[PDB]
Nucleic acid binder design. Structure first.
Ligand code: FES
Ligand code: MG
Ligand code: MG
Ligand code: MG
Ligand code: MG
Ligand code: MG
Ligand code: MG
Ligand code: MG
Ligand code: MG
Ligand code: MG
Ligand code: MG
Lengths: 108, 86, 92, 46, 96, 99, 70, 137, 23
RNA sequence: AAACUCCAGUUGACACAAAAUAGACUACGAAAGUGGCUUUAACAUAUCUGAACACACAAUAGCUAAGACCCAAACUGGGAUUAGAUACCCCACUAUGCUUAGCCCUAAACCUCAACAGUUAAAUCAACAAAACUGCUCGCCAGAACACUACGAGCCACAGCUUAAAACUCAAA
């Protein structure tokens, strides 16, 4: 189905961020994914302090990866994100656009 | 513990009015339910007792709202008698 | 429970007195009961329980003004039931 | 119409060839999902 | 006789009232919108008696807020100060 | 419920009383009243609507009949012998302007 | 009644007439009632397309000289 | 300029200053108001403990310790010991709903310190540990 | 409802449980 | 009063535990139950009824094994009170509450309303509960107590569960 990967990456310089993004997308493709688009939400202060890989983070880069993947890929990809040291936090959700916007007639 | 400090539940003082700021903080903590949470968490409330209490409070609020609406609707008739004598 | 019908239709004593004094003071310390009660700054002197535990008399210090005393008395009497409910809900 | 839309959409998917260029372009871009609502039910964009 | 009333649906029927978010998509990434329904001082989610939202959109906002908070998009214990100057849509006053 | 057969319809949640039936009912009522008055029967108007107590009393006095627009004490009719006397005569017809 | 539909549209487009109702007059004629009568006449002497009837009725009433602010 | 009840953001530059210092540089008075005791500690913005005074360290014992007067005395003493270290402005952070929640702040004000902001940091678990059973008194 | 039947059930059960413990 | 002072306060690091606010919502599931986030499976039946035992399930408590252990806590110690207090109050700490794999099969397991279909007309209708009924099916009931008992039988249960009497007694319950 269609999934969205919300990625909070280590606050790094441009070459390292580019390498990390390429590595993540390559993992997605290796797991059978068709990557649709990559969106950069920007570098920002984290809402709270996040401890990952024996390091404390207060700032991070927010990215979105839209893709289509088989259902078996997701779990595998999750494990991969657990091992990547440049990933503060990764989450794969069902793509919000795929969710249907049922119409409402108002308050009864 | 992991959040930024001096933003949550923080009040600034205006022209050295410390008491007004403290009372505003008390108002905020009560309106957000934090005071009630802290007081209720001193001892364990059993799930059945919790359910009964919430049911009672919901029904009491509904009943009070309906009674208030009834009185406000019937207060319109409360005026000076227009047919005095007859 | 069909609440609509219901709505429509001695050493120990000293310990309880002290406990209820502390509890009622701490309830009056905040707007937990109501903002109108909080703004009054009602101070309690003592709590006395009748020997048969049929009533809890909470003695509140009066002020010098008379209209303030009457307003305080009105608010307190109007808020007694909610205070009782809170005291049992907090399991004091 | 579903198939035609998907056909024209696939032309802008990230393949193994454009991965570097697309990553750089995304690094040189910013997307904003934030927007607020008013009491009248109107959207105010950032 | 032509003057008799005719069977008909009420033509003066007023449209059913709609919540402020009716017809609009609520996303966990739109932290600006989600922050309009939490307490500025504690970050607690407002009830529907305050937000005025219908049940469906109240549930949508609650789920989006929890998702954003756990995924590292939104703070938990306070409203992000960047959104303190947004339009006020909730019927609550702290007399602040 | 028992007033439904007499209702023409409901115009924007406001009932409309069918006047074609009102005409026949009023004809029968007025005929009965006229016949009772011809027979020299006692006619007692009753109404607790205070907006019209004065008007009803004036009308009753004018037509030489009787009115009761005031509080109805228990037993005017069922206990009339104790409350008026052993030989009181009760009304032959009562007209409710407000029931 | 049929004209209720027309009335509804009127009260939604031109709003409540600034002229006040006089219910004591048994033959009172509102702006909405004039619009209804003109609409019925245009329907009976012409075709049946509701929107065209609406605009034609508005034009005819404005020609008569009654103000109708949308 | 409209007074803002919300605190300044350390990131966003603001013009509010106290003795030339910013909000994030003022010392902090941490008050812990327990049910039987009140403990005040003044620390720097860099977490250097300057002064410390509780109701117990000021001689009060047992039930007298959990009173408003005891908290006032502790606040006065903490304010004195902090005044001996160059503190005039403080940001207050109270933790707990004990009797000395406000009396300790009163004592701090009466000892010479100026309060610019009040914060509440009472622990509220989102259902973590289970509390003890209610008393059968 | 008759609470005495519930009380009698309580007494009989408690009396029964004592006997099995004893013997 | 005991207890601790390897105590207490700020800061930082940090769960196999339970899940503020939303929820003033009343949703899901056969019921029991289910209220932190994500993802994958996934919520039978295009007549109805149909079982103490057949086939699957069943809160809490409890029993076997291994594991985890913050907090709470039957028991067990200490402190205080009391005429006595090994209860109530304070402190400490177990089985247990948690995970895995097996058992046990009980609740005011209650909406104290058996499942499906239909009606609102009648006299509405002992009472109260929760407006009164009709058709059809299954289950169950024929005074109280003896009795959630005895015996028999079945059961991973062995002070256990299901089924469940009679004798004596009474004019009531
Ligand atoms: S009223 Fe339509 S979505 Fe809320
Ligand atoms: Mg079946
Ligand atoms: Mg059978
Ligand atoms: Mg059974
Ligand atoms: Mg079980
Ligand atoms: Mg243990
Ligand atoms: Mg029940
Ligand atoms: Mg059945
Ligand atoms: Mg049993
Ligand atoms: Mg046997
Ligand atoms: Mg047995």
């Amino acid at each position: 189905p269609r999934y969205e990967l919300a990625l909070i990456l280590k606050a790094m310089q441009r070459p390292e961020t580019a390498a990390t993004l390429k590595r993540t997308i390559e993992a997605l493709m290796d797991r059978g994914a068709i990557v649709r688009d990559l969106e950069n939400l920007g570098e920002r202060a984290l809402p709270y302090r996040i401890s990952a890989h024996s390091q404390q983070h207060n700032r991070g880069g927010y990215f979105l990866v839209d893709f289509y993947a088989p259902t078996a890929a997701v779990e595998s990809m999750v494990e991969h994100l657990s091992r990547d040291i440049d990933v503060i936090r990764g989450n794969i959700v069902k793509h919000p656009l795929t969710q249907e916007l049922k119409e409402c007639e108002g308050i009864v | 513990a992991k959040h930024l400090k001096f933003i949550a539940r923080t009040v600034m003082v205006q022209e050295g009015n410390v008491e007004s700021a403290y009372r505003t903080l008390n108002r905020i903590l009560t309106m957000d339910g934090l005071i009630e949470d802290i007081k209720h968490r001193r001892y364990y409330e059993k799930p059945c007792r919790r359910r009964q209490r919430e049911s009672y409070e919901r029904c009491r609020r509904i009943y009070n709202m309906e009674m208030a609406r009834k009185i406000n609707f019937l207060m319109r008739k409360n005026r000076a008698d227009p047919w005095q004598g007859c | 429970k069909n609440w609509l019908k219901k709505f429509a239709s001695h050493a120990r004593l000293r310990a309880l007195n002290g406990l209820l004094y502390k509890a009622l003071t701490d309830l009056l310390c905040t707007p937990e009961v109501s903002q109108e009660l909080y703004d009054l700054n009602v101070e309690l002197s003592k709590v006395s329980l009748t020997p048969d535990f049929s009533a809890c008399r909470a003695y509140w210090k009066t002020t010098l003004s008379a209209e303030q005393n009457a307003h305080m008395e009105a608010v307190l009497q109007r808020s007694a039931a909610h205070m009782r409910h809170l005291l049992m809900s907090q399991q004091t | 119409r579903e198939v035609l839309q998907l056909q024209e959409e696939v032309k802008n998917f990230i393949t193994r060839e454009n991965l570097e260029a697309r990553v750089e372009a995304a690094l040189d871009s910013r997307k904003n999902y934030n927007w607020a609502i008013t009491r009248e039910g109107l959207v105010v964009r950032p | 006789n032509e003057d008799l009333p005719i069977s008909m649906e009420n033509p003066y029927k007023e449209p059913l009232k709609k919540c402020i978010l009716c017809g609009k998509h609520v996303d966990y990434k739109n932290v600006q919108l989600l922050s309009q329904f939490v307490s500025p001082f504690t970050g607690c989610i407002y009830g529907r008696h305050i937000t005025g939202l219908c049940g469906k959109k109240q549930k949508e906002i609650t789920k989006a807020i929890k998702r954003a908070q756990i995924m590292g998009f939104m703070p938990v214990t306070y409203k992000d100060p960047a959104y303190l100057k947004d339009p006020k849509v909730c019927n609550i006053r702290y007399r602040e | 419920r028992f007033m439904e057969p007499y209702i023409f319809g409901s115009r924007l949640d406001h009932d409309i009383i069918d006047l074609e039936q009102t005409a026949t009912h009023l004809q029968l009522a007025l005929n009965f009243t006229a016949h009772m008055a011809y027979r020299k029967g006692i006619i007692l108007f009753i109404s607790r609507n205070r907006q019209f107590s004065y008007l009803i009393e004036n009308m009753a006095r004018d037509c030489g009949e009787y009115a009761h627009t005031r509080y109805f004490r228990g037993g005017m009719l069922t206990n009339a012998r104790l409350l008026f006397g052993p030989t009181v005569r009760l009304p032959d017809l009562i007209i409710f302007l407000h029931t | 009644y049929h004209e209720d539909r027309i009335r509804a549209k009127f009260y939604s487009v031109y709003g409540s007439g600034q002229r006040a109702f006089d219910l004591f007059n048994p033959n009172f004629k509102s702006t909405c009632q004039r619009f209804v009568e003109k609409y019925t006449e245009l329907q009976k002497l012409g075709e049946t397309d509701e929107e065209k009837l609406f605009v034609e009725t508005g034009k005819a009433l404005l020609a008569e000289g009654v103000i109708l602010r949308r | 300029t409209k007074f803002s009840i919300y605190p300044p953001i350390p990131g966003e530059e603001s013009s509010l200053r106290w003795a030339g210092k910013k909000f994030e540089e003022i010392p902090i008075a941490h008050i812990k108001a327990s049910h039987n005791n009140t403990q005040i500690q003044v620390v720097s913005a860099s977490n250097e403990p300057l002064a410390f005074a509780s109701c117990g360290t000021e001689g009060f014992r047992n039930a007298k310790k959990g009173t408003g007067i005891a908290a006032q005395t502790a606040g006065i003493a903490a304010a004195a010991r902090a005044k001996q270290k160059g503190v005039i402005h403080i940001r207050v952070v109270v933790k707990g709903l004990g009797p000395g929640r406000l009396s300790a702040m009163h004592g701090l004000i009466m000892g010479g310190l100026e309060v610019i902001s009040i914060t509440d940091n009472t622990p509220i678990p989102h259902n973590g540990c289970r509390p003890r059973k209610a008393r059968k008194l | 409802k008759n609470v005495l039947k519930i009380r009698r059930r309580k007494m009989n059960h408690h009396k029964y449980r004592k006997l099995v413990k004893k013997t």
